């Protein structure tokens, strides 16, 4: 409700530049050996527009 991005990780991330859910974070699979990237294609322009722009309109 203010941040233009969300982290879809299991324990940690690295990248953070998206929308509400259109951001592509990283995930150091809390219970894994490798770190993969999150899907930053979730064009939640509504979540984002309503997240950052929704509050500070």
């Amino acid at each position: 409700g203010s941040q233009v991005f969300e982290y879809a990780e299991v324990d940690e991330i690295v990248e953070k530049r998206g929308k509400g859910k259109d951001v592509e974070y990283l995930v150091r699979w809390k219970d894994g050996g490798d770190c993969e990237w999150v899907k930053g294609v979730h064009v939640a322009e509504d979540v984002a527009k309503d997240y950052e722009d929704g509050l500070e309109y």
């Binding site: 879809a8 990780e9 509400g20 995930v27 894994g32 999150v38 899907k39 064009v43």
Partner: peptide, 14 residues
């Protein structure tokens, strides 16, 4: 479910 990355939530993408 998805081995590797995760999803914040239902993630609304139009």
């Amino acid at each position: 479910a998805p081995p590797g990355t995760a999803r914040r939530k239902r993630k609304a993408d139009s």
